[PDB]
Design a protein around this motif. Structure first.
Motif, PDB file in Angstrom:
ATOM      1  N   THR A 130       0.832  -1.200   0.000  1.00 34.20           N
ATOM      2  CA  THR A 130       0.000   0.000   0.000  1.00 34.20           C
ATOM      3  C   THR A 130       0.873   1.260   0.000  1.00 34.20           C
ATOM      4  O   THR A 130       0.580   2.219  -0.736  1.00 34.20           O
ATOM      5  CB  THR A 130      -0.995   0.055   1.165  1.00 34.20           C
ATOM      6  OG1 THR A 130      -0.302  -0.170   2.395  1.00 34.20           O
ATOM      7  CG2 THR A 130      -2.088  -0.996   0.981  1.00 34.20           C
ATOM      8  N   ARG A 131       1.951   1.264   0.780  1.00 33.78           N
ATOM      9  CA  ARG A 131       2.823   2.438   0.725  1.00 33.78           C
ATOM     10  C   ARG A 131       3.672   2.510  -0.542  1.00 33.78           C
ATOM     11  O   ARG A 131       4.141   3.597  -0.891  1.00 33.78           O
ATOM     12  CB  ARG A 131       3.646   2.590   1.992  1.00 33.78           C
ATOM     13  CG  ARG A 131       4.647   1.504   2.284  1.00 33.78           C
ATOM     14  CD  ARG A 131       5.246   1.858   3.670  1.00 33.78           C
ATOM     15  NE  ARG A 131       6.157   0.830   4.183  1.00 33.78           N
ATOM     16  CZ  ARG A 131       7.416   0.657   3.789  1.00 33.78           C
ATOM     17  NH1 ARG A 131       7.949   1.461   2.866  1.00 33.78           N
ATOM     18  NH2 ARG A 131       8.154  -0.316   4.336  1.00 33.78           N
ATOM     19  N   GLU A 132       3.833   1.384  -1.239  1.00 33.90           N
ATOM     20  CA  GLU A 132       4.273   1.461  -2.642  1.00 33.90           C
ATOM     21  C   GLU A 132       3.235   2.159  -3.507  1.00 33.90           C
ATOM     22  O   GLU A 132       3.612   2.855  -4.454  1.00 33.90           O
ATOM     23  CB  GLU A 132       4.567   0.094  -3.236  1.00 33.90           C
ATOM     24  CG  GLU A 132       5.844  -0.521  -2.696  1.00 33.90           C
ATOM     25  CD  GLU A 132       6.193  -1.831  -3.374  1.00 33.90           C
ATOM     26  OE1 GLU A 132       5.363  -2.378  -4.145  1.00 33.90           O
ATOM     27  OE2 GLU A 132       7.338  -2.298  -3.184  1.00 33.90           O
ATOM     28  N   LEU A 133       1.944   1.987  -3.215  1.00 35.85           N
ATOM     29  CA  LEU A 133       0.952   2.790  -3.954  1.00 35.85           C
ATOM     30  C   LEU A 133       0.962   4.255  -3.553  1.00 35.85           C
ATOM     31  O   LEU A 133       0.584   5.081  -4.363  1.00 35.85           O
ATOM     32  CB  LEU A 133      -0.465   2.275  -3.816  1.00 35.85           C
ATOM     33  CG  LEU A 133      -1.020   1.260  -4.808  1.00 35.85           C
ATOM     34  CD1 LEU A 133      -0.625  -0.114  -4.309  1.00 35.85           C
ATOM     35  CD2 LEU A 133      -2.546   1.407  -4.832  1.00 35.85           C
ATOM     36  N   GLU A 134       1.343   4.587  -2.320  1.00 33.54           N
ATOM     37  CA  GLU A 134       1.498   6.017  -2.014  1.00 33.54           C
ATOM     38  C   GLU A 134       2.695   6.627  -2.754  1.00 33.54           C
ATOM     39  O   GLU A 134       2.614   7.762  -3.247  1.00 33.54           O
ATOM     40  CB  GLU A 134       1.593   6.288  -0.508  1.00 33.54           C
ATOM     41  CG  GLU A 134       0.246   6.598   0.158  1.00 33.54           C
ATOM     42  CD  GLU A 134      -0.437   5.404   0.841  1.00 33.54           C
ATOM     43  OE1 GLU A 134       0.201   4.361   1.057  1.00 33.54           O
ATOM     44  OE2 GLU A 134      -1.644   5.507   1.155  1.00 33.54           O
ATOM     45  N   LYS A 135       3.798   5.877  -2.847  1.00 32.76           N
ATOM     46  CA  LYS A 135       5.008   6.413  -3.482  1.00 32.76           C
ATOM     47  C   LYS A 135       4.836   6.494  -5.008  1.00 32.76           C
ATOM     48  O   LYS A 135       5.102   7.545  -5.618  1.00 32.76           O
ATOM     49  CB  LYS A 135       6.192   5.571  -3.085  1.00 32.76           C
ATOM     50  CG  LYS A 135       7.543   6.001  -3.599  1.00 32.76           C
ATOM     51  CD  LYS A 135       8.630   5.104  -2.958  1.00 32.76           C
ATOM     52  CE  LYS A 135       9.909   4.887  -3.793  1.00 32.76           C
ATOM     53  NZ  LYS A 135      10.580   6.192  -4.050  1.00 32.76           N
ATOM     54  N   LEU A 136       4.382   5.403  -5.609  1.00 26.67           N
ATOM     55  CA  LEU A 136       4.078   5.422  -7.043  1.00 26.67           C
ATOM     56  C   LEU A 136       2.862   6.269  -7.398  1.00 26.67           C
ATOM     57  O   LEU A 136       2.700   6.635  -8.551  1.00 26.67           O
ATOM     58  CB  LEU A 136       3.852   4.022  -7.590  1.00 26.67           C
ATOM     59  CG  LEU A 136       5.021   3.062  -7.594  1.00 26.67           C
ATOM     60  CD1 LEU A 136       4.511   1.688  -8.025  1.00 26.67           C
ATOM     61  CD2 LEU A 136       6.125   3.564  -8.497  1.00 26.67           C
ATOM     62  N   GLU A 137       2.003   6.569  -6.428  1.00 26.53           N
ATOM     63  CA  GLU A 137       0.835   7.387  -6.720  1.00 26.53           C
ATOM     64  C   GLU A 137       1.195   8.851  -6.666  1.00 26.53           C
ATOM     65  O   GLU A 137       0.688   9.627  -7.449  1.00 26.53           O
ATOM     66  CB  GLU A 137      -0.308   7.097  -5.756  1.00 26.53           C
ATOM     67  CG  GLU A 137      -1.610   7.790  -6.083  1.00 26.53           C
ATOM     68  CD  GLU A 137      -2.257   7.306  -7.388  1.00 26.53           C
ATOM     69  OE1 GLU A 137      -2.093   6.120  -7.737  1.00 26.53           O
ATOM     70  OE2 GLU A 137      -2.963   8.098  -8.060  1.00 26.53           O
ATOM     71  N   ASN A 138       2.017   9.272  -5.726  1.00 22.17           N
ATOM     72  CA  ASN A 138       2.335  10.692  -5.707  1.00 22.17           C
ATOM     73  C   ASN A 138       3.439  11.047  -6.707  1.00 22.17           C
ATOM     74  O   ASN A 138       3.558  12.195  -7.093  1.00 22.17           O
ATOM     75  CB  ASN A 138       2.579  11.226  -4.272  1.00 22.17           C
ATOM     76  CG  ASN A 138       3.819  10.652  -3.602  1.00 22.17           C
ATOM     77  OD1 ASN A 138       4.569   9.866  -4.178  1.00 22.17           O
ATOM     78  ND2 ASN A 138       4.028  11.045  -2.359  1.00 22.17           N
TER      79      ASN A 138
END
Length: 218
Positions: A130-138
Motif C-alpha cells: 500500500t505504501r508502494e501505492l502512495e510512493k508510485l501514486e504521488n
RNA sequence: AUGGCUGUCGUCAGCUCGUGUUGUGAAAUGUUGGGUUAAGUCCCGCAACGAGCGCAACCCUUAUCCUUUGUUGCCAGCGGU
C-alpha cells in the motif's frame, strides 16, 4: 484574458541577464516584470496552446514546488489532462520506456488494491504494498493515464524545473513556461514573464491556461 | 598446454550489466550523499531508470507445545508379584 492583477514581479536575488528584455525593475532592490510585455506573451501562449489543445493533444502541467500543488492537480484535473505535482523523476519523457513499466506497476497494484487480493496472505507485506501505492501514486500521479509522451508541456517555474524543460527540448516538445527574473529562457518556446512562487499568481495563471485548454466551441 | 576437483583472500560484502545521460576519450553515473544495518540491509534523496550474481529467506539440526501410532520403547493409575 483579464489583466494580471496581483503579482508585479519578484526575485531581487540571482536575477538573470537574459531576463533583461522583460524587466521594468525599480522598487526596493527587487525586480518588476514589465507586465505590458507579459500580456502579449501570455496571450500568444494561450493562442498556440489552445491550437494544440484543439488538435486533441496532451498537455502535462508541471508543478513540483509548493504551493503549485494541488493547484496543478486542480487545474490539470479540471481539464481531462495530466500533471506532475511532486518530484519530477529525472527522465519520465526521455526514457518514458522504463517509466511506462513503472506506470504499469501502478495500474496493476491499484487494480490489485481496491478490488483484488489486498488482505491476502500477509498484513506487513500488504502495508508495504500500500505504501508502494502512495510512493508510485504521488510520483506518477497525473501521468498514469497518459499512455503517450505528450504534445506540449506547461511548466510553472523554469529554473526549478529545468530538468523537464531540458528533456522536452531534447524531444521536440513545445515548452510553455512562466519564467521569473531568476530563470532562463532555455528552450522555452513560449516564454511568459511572470511570477513563479505567488499562489494568487499561479492560480490566476493556471486558471487561464486550464480555461483555454478545455475551452469549447459547443 | 588442459578438463575435473580443491585451497585461499573470505561467508569478506561486495562484483557487474542493459537502456539513458555526461566526457573528444580512457571512462563516469547508477553503486555516490543523510540516516540505518550483520549485510550496496532498508528508508529518504538524487541523471538516472531498472536488472543479474552475492546478502537475507527457502534446507538440516537444536530449544517449546499439539495430533497420530505405540513395538523391542515407557510405566502414572490399577492386581498379585
Amino acid at each position: 484574458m483579464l489583466k494580471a492583477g496581483v503579482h508585479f514581479g519578484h526575485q531581487t536575488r540571482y536575477w538573470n541577464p537574459k531576463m533583461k528584455p522583460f524587466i521594468f525593475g525599480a522598487r526596493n532592490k527587487v525586480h518588476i516584470i514589465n507586465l505590458e510585455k507579459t500580456v502579449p506573451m501570455f496571450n500568444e501562449a494561450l493562442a498556440e496552446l489552445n491550437k494544440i489543445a484543439s488538435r486533441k493533444g496532451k498537455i502535462l502541467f508541471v508543478g513540483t514546488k509548493r504551493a503549485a500543488s494541488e493547484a496543478v492537480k486542480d487545474a490539470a484535473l479540471s481539464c481531462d489532462q495530466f500533471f506532475v505535482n511532486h518530484r519530477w523523476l529525472g527522465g519520465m519523457l526521455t526514457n518514458w520506456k522504463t517509466v511506462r513499466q513503472s506506470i504499469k506497476r501502478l495500474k496493476d497494484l491499484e487494480t490489485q488494491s481496491q478490488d483484488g487480493t489486498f488482505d491476502k496472505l500477509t498484513k506487513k507485506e500488504a502495508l508495504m504494498r500500500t505504501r508502494e501505492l502512495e510512493k508510485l501514486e504521488n510520483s506518477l500521479g497525473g501521468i498514469k493515464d497518459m499512455g503517450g509522451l505528450p504534445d506540449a508541456l506547461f511548466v510553472i517555474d523554469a529554473d526549478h524545473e529545468h530538468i523537464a524543460i531540458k528533456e522536452a527540448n531534447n524531444l521536440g516538445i513545445p515548452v510553455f513556461a512562466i519564467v521569473d527574473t531568476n530563470s532562463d529562457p532555455d528552450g522555452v518556446d513560449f516564454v511568459i514573464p511572470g511570477n513563479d512562487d505567488a499562489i494568487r499568481a499561479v492560480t490566476l495563471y493556471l486558471g487561464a491556461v486550464a480555461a483555454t485548454v478545455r475551452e469549447g466551441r459547443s
